[PDB]
A and B are shown apart, each in its own frame.
With several copies, the nearest count.
Chain A
Amino acid sequence: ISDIVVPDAKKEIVKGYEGQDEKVQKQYERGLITKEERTQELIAIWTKATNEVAEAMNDNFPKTNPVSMMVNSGARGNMMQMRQIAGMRGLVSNAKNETIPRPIKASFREGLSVLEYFISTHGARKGLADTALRTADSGYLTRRLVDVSQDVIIREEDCGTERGLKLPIATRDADGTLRKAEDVETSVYARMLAEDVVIDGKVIAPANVDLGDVLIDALVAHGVEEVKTRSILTCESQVGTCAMCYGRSLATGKLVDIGEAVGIIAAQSIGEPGTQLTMRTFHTGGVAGD
Chain B
Amino acid sequence: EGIINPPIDELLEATDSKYSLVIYAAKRARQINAYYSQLGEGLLEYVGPLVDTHVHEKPLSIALREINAGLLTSEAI
Establish whether A and B are touching in the complex (CB under 8 Å). yes
Note all chain B residues with C-beta closer than 8 A to A258: 17
* Tally of A interface residues using CB under 8 Å: 3
A257 lies within 8 A of chain B by Cβ: yes
* Tally of B interface residues using CB under 8 Å: 3
> What per-residue 1/0 map shows which CB atoms of A258-280 lie under 8 Å from chain B?
11000000000000000000000
Determine the residue in chain A with the shortest Cβ distance to B17. Answer: A257
Note all chain A residues with C-beta closer than 8 A to B18: 257
What DSSP secondary structure best describes chain A's contact surface? Answer: loop
> What per-residue 1/0 map shows which CB atoms of B1-19 lie under 8 Å from chain A?
0000000000000000111
Least distance between B64 CB and chain A CB atoms (Å): 19
Least distance between A240 CB and chain B CB atoms (Å): 15
Note all chain A residues with C-beta closer than 8 A to B19: 257, 259
Determine the residue in chain B with the shortest Cβ distance to A252. Answer: B18
Least distance between B65 CB and chain A CB atoms (Å): 24
> What per-residue 1/0 map shows which CB atoms of A238-262 lie under 8 Å from chain B?
0000000000000000000111000
B residues 5-57 near A (Cβ < 8 Å) are 17-19
Note all chain A residues with C-beta closer than 8 A to B17: 257-258
What is A's interface to B at a CB cutoff of 8 Å? 257-259
What is B's interface to A at a CB cutoff of 8 Å? 17-19
What are 5 A-B contacts defined by CB distance under 8 Å? A257-B17, A257-B18, A257-B19, A258-B17, A259-B19
